[PDB]
Design an enzyme around this catalytic site. Sequence first.
Site, PDB file in Angstrom:
ATOM      1  N   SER B 195       0.802  -1.215   0.000  1.00  0.00           N
ATOM      2  CA  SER B 195       0.000   0.000   0.000  1.00  0.00           C
ATOM      3  C   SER B 195       0.847   1.283   0.000  1.00  0.00           C
ATOM      4  O   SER B 195       1.369   1.647  -1.033  1.00  0.00           O
ATOM      5  CB  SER B 195      -1.051  -0.042   1.105  1.00  0.00           C
ATOM      6  OG  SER B 195      -2.051   0.962   0.911  1.00  0.00           O
ATOM      7  N   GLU B 322      -9.172  -5.112  -3.704  1.00  0.00           N
ATOM      8  CA  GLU B 322      -8.547  -3.997  -2.965  1.00  0.00           C
ATOM      9  C   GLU B 322      -9.566  -3.062  -2.293  1.00  0.00           C
ATOM     10  O   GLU B 322      -9.332  -2.579  -1.188  1.00  0.00           O
ATOM     11  CB  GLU B 322      -7.635  -3.190  -3.863  1.00  0.00           C
ATOM     12  CG  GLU B 322      -6.581  -4.002  -4.580  1.00  0.00           C
ATOM     13  CD  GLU B 322      -5.320  -4.266  -3.727  1.00  0.00           C
ATOM     14  OE1 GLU B 322      -5.263  -3.819  -2.559  1.00  0.00           O
ATOM     15  OE2 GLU B 322      -4.375  -4.912  -4.234  1.00  0.00           O
ATOM     16  N   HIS B 435      -7.569  -5.892   0.396  1.00  0.00           N
ATOM     17  CA  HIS B 435      -6.363  -5.104   0.513  1.00  0.00           C
ATOM     18  C   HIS B 435      -5.636  -5.486   1.794  1.00  0.00           C
ATOM     19  O   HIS B 435      -6.189  -5.387   2.877  1.00  0.00           O
ATOM     20  CB  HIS B 435      -6.757  -3.646   0.540  1.00  0.00           C
ATOM     21  CG  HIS B 435      -5.607  -2.718   0.679  1.00  0.00           C
ATOM     22  ND1 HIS B 435      -4.844  -2.314  -0.393  1.00  0.00           N
ATOM     23  CD2 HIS B 435      -5.106  -2.086   1.760  1.00  0.00           C
ATOM     24  CE1 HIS B 435      -3.917  -1.474   0.022  1.00  0.00           C
ATOM     25  NE2 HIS B 435      -4.048  -1.328   1.332  1.00  0.00           N
TER      26      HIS B 435
END
Lengths: 531, 531, 531
Positions: B195, B322, B435
């Site tokens: 991320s 995600e 995610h």
Amino acid sequence: IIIATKNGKVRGMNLTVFGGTVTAFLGIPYAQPPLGRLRFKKPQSLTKWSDIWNATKYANSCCQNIDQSFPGFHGSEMWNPNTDLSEDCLYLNVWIPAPKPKNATVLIWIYGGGFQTGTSSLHVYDGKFLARVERVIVVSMNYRVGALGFLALPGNPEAPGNMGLFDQQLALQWVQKNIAAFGGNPKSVTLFGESAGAASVSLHLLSPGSHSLFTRAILQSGSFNAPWAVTSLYEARNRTLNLAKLTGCSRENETEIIKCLRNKDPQEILLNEAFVVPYGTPLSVNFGPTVDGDFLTDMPDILLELGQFKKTQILVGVNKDEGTAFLVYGAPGFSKDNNSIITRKEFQEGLKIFFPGVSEFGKESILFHYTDWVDDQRPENYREALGDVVGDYNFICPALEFTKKFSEWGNNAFFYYFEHRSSKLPWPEWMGVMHGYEIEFVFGLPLERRDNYTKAEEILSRSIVKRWANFAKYGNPNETQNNSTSWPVFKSTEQKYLTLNTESTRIMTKLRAQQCRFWTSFFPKVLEMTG
Amino acid sequence: IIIATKNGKVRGMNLTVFGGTVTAFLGIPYAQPPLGRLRFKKPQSLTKWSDIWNATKYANSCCQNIDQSFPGFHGSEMWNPNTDLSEDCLYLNVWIPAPKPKNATVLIWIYGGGFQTGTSSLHVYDGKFLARVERVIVVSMNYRVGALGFLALPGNPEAPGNMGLFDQQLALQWVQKNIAAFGGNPKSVTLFGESAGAASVSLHLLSPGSHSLFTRAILQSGSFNAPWAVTSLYEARNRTLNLAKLTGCSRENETEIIKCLRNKDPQEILLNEAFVVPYGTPLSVNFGPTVDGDFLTDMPDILLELGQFKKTQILVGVNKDEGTAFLVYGAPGFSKDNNSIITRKEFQEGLKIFFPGVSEFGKESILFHYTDWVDDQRPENYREALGDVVGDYNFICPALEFTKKFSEWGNNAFFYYFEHRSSKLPWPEWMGVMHGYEIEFVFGLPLERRDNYTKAEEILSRSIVKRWANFAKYGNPNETQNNSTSWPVFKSTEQKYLTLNTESTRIMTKLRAQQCRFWTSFFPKVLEMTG
Amino acid sequence: IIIATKNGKVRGMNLTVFGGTVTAFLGIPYAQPPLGRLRFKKPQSLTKWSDIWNATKYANSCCQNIDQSFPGFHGSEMWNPNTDLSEDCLYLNVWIPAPKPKNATVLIWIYGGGFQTGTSSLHVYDGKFLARVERVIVVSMNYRVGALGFLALPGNPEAPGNMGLFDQQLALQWVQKNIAAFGGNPKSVTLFGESAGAASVSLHLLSPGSHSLFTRAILQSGSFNAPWAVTSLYEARNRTLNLAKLTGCSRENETEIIKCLRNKDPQEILLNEAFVVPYGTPLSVNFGPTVDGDFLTDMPDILLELGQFKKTQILVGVNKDEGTAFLVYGAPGFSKDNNSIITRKEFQEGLKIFFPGVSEFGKESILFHYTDWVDDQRPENYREALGDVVGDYNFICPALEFTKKFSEWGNNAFFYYFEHRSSKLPWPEWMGVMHGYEIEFVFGLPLERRDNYTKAEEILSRSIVKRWANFAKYGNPNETQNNSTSWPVFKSTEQKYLTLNTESTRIMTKLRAQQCRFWTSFFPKVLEMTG
């Protein structure tokens, strides 16, 4: 003659070769004797000596078992060591051409012998002829073999594995440091080895520590990817244990195992070696190379597959009959003294001898592939098929697979198929062009008028001697003066190779192509199935 | 174990991992504590210490707000820090394989968390398994986040911006200097992050100061060109001001603003952070990276477009889902506890939640693109479309655009699409492959027999662990032993990528191609129109 | 602000540009004043000074004749020097962006003026805007011009030629040594110049001494291969003699000629300059660059043709109406005050004015080529053709030929055609896009809200300013944010170039292709014929 090396000075001798002179330095030490505490450890370096070292005779061969199958017989005995066995063994020889050259190209020989045996001082490894005839420096060294060279307790600095391989590497470091003093070009160094010395050479191609210690590599009848050449981290550990057991050396503290092993008699160790693997095979490598994290940083298959190796030219080749040598060491119906005609039933036993732990399936596939022939009941059919099985599987196909994967990453490779039988060969006709019998010609032995080699053989050796020197000097094994048909590059698509013979000398393509598709694709798949 | 670094010596610990040993050095400092005067400044270097540093426990996580939406709930809590928060925070960890290697390849982890949160000491970032299983050195570091890490007054050396990014860079400098002492290859260093650590990694690719501090880069679910990742010179300045205002810190002399900010309580700062941007979004990056002239010499879009970056291989990838993680932090109709079926009307609100300042047009185009389906009134239709909107727009499309533009300049890129849902996942079925949920597998967590991961998951993790190590070591994420279908290079024309799963593992092309043409061409055009 | 250079320290000033700050260092010396004995010699280096140099105002322009054709008129006066003329003239300026950068890219300006005139301190060469807006360091220097800069007695070390060119080179050496101290990247240096500064820049591309003193080159309306730019070894010598004659300085001992010339009054020299060439032309370069054996080791035509030059990217361009500027300095029927409609008969005289020593043939060919039109008796026909003759022949075609020959050897070249007329231009409509009138836009002058440039012009300048900075920083003059149609590479086959305008901005091919085939092939052939 007296030369100063970085650890003091050495005295050589003057040899007379072909109306001329070669300077020999037999038996220079290159490491501390791996005795007492040092047994099983990486080779430790030498400290300076104030005087002169008399480097005028071959040093001690390294501790190993001798072949007593055929006592008195030259065919087997020429491979046995010819100086006293001693753990005090880490010595190297050097031959220099007639007047000292200025920066001569260096050939460094690494002997074969399945990693259990062998020495640098055999008659057929005599590099005097190469220095005289091609004006190269030849070096060879002795390295530890069997357990004393390859016993492994994965990671334990007391027996890390690959010590014989570090031995070689330390003699490569020697040459980088010293060869300049002898009139050799440290930047022009070619490794050549046979059988396990070939496998050894392929390992230096992968070994980061060895990376800048040579320039090119020549590989005769062997390569690391052969079934026999690399021992798995598990088996090496298991085999170390079974040794301890066999010598009343099993402990708890692992470091204590080495402590008692380090105290056993050399001969005690040598005697139990043959007994650490469960099922014999004549191609048994009881203590070989392993993945140690030091000399080899990873499984060699991955390294090769991902092009992580020294990028350079290479010359690789095999013999018409690699497999036959082994049939006389355990396969039923075979003898050097009869013409060994065997029956389907014996062939099938031969198979069990050489593929001990393999499914009824594996064995029935091998059989089907090598048994589809122009029968007419040629009595020799089965005798011939067993040799080809052994040879293909153990030498030819892996040597061909190694060349493919190497050349995929861009460098020139040259492949040879050596098909001439020495007129002098002690073993019988049937056994053909045996594993080991090109060395004589590479080393120039037939160039000696006074032995009983044929004129034809003298021409063949000469030509080989030249192509090898040319590879070493120039990276191109051509013979530009007398030769018709130059040697083409091996490329993964077309796969061309050159034929080495007294008659023809042809350029051909895709050697043993059916046989290798079997051994490298089909048979692996059958092994997969049965556990 | 005791190792000497250039600033004095450190003591580690011995950890036992999978019948073997990993040496851990938790919490070595790498910079001066950014306290008092030093707050908001670039990290200052350490001076020598005469004794031994006990590097045997994780150091303080860095000051940040905690997630209190789901108290007690593992799914959110595993991401919260697990040591005391302190401004005295700039520390790094190191794991070394079992016997010290010689020059081992280094993985340096940079954690994600939208630049507002996160620490190096989470259970899922434990690099012991990678060092044990692949014989790599793993390093991770802590870097400042939110205002304390990214407050910017453009050009003012008292708060220049990108301090968290210099923190990372100073730990990269540490490794260049020190890793040799630990048996690591300073020339073989791979950055991997997720991320915002992925975005971070992409920034080092652009950052001239970082250029020679690593070799390759791996980028998991993020990249600098994502809508969330880079804050404009204007907004950073505006946001600094609104902070001053919120803390009674507005002045005239700009340098005086920092002076009072530098005196406020850490918690005071942390509390007003969430309130400096006008409209909330669950993907809000209140204080992030900016163009500072120092770490980043120019707008990253230009730099990327003109091929001004470190030329090297890169591995980039995203997850099936995600976007879902974020829906439970503000989108109406969503809850981790029901199966969150939503109505067109809610979807439309979700849209306002995530695209706060966007024209009736933008929102009606998003809607039209994600709403063309095989209706049959699948009740989940709208729930599924909102997640894909969020994910595509914020993670997948930018990750795909970054790979295209990078590979245009010649280097090999590899792209992955991770589609496996952890059997252990605390969040519900609908939320899919969230995610953040590949990290566990990269770090080898399922390799641990004694947790409750499936055999399948153990095989998947193993394979991933190998491909990542192979990328780091060799620049090629292949898994040569067990794997069928090798991983192809991403090239701007064909755009191939590999599927990571427990079942299939396929090679596919042009991921989310319609969706990305929308997000990267059409939608930008609509934004352009309305001011 | 105070910076230490290798010859002692200098003090600058703080300028306020666009709500921000630029640091200026006006008038730093970089060589010994070329006075007394030193006149006419290569520039000699400085020795250390113990104190601080106040570098806070523009230094003396260099000795030159002033343009008095239009007294009070801005159009001509903005080109006249704006500080006292002095032989004590070798000084340079430097502008630094707002907070000192770390390693900023450097633009070094070299002014035009036909090598007889010009200074670095003109309003339109003010590099404050470039440093503020693009964060580059801008440097400009003053170099000797006319005789004091280019008088040549071939080989005689007392007047070797190309002294103005060594002046430039010594300021390039200065920057290599010093710019680091100012926060500039000595490895990222771009030369840009106009008219004779462009020619100058092309010479550094050929000059071995200059080879490592910069990185890229930008060339605006000029190049060494232009009819006006290089003086032959014969003419330079002849012109030196005629000067001696005109100043009662003819001798026998050649070295004695320089001795008396070195004693004459500066103004005495300046007065007779205009009179050393037999026939006036408004494009007369009385004392220019010559082949000296030192700065230029060979005839530049050969050097270019054989690819002996700095291999790098280059940006080259010209203006719609290069030729018009000159028509008002001697061509009959022309005046800045009427719309200058001329008759065939005047045109023909214009021709004699600009091609003084040329065959009835040459002149009748020029006439035929520029006179084939859509007549309708457009009254301006002939006025327009004379300008295009002048421009094509003197600026456009040579600039196009130089780009071709350069790009033949592999590097990227970019070519531009600047077609916008400043709304503020003091000269009349007919005179179009004059030679010299892109400089304002390159230097960012229209970015200044408070002058009376149009919004359109502000957008155009901005875009140019960006493309130039991008070329300097990255070797690629693209404008990635606002621009549609990127700037393509000039290649000898296709010959693409970009159009610079307020409206269209198009990509076109083969500029003035008929006209250049005439000037570069046909007309040379006619000159050949008549002696």
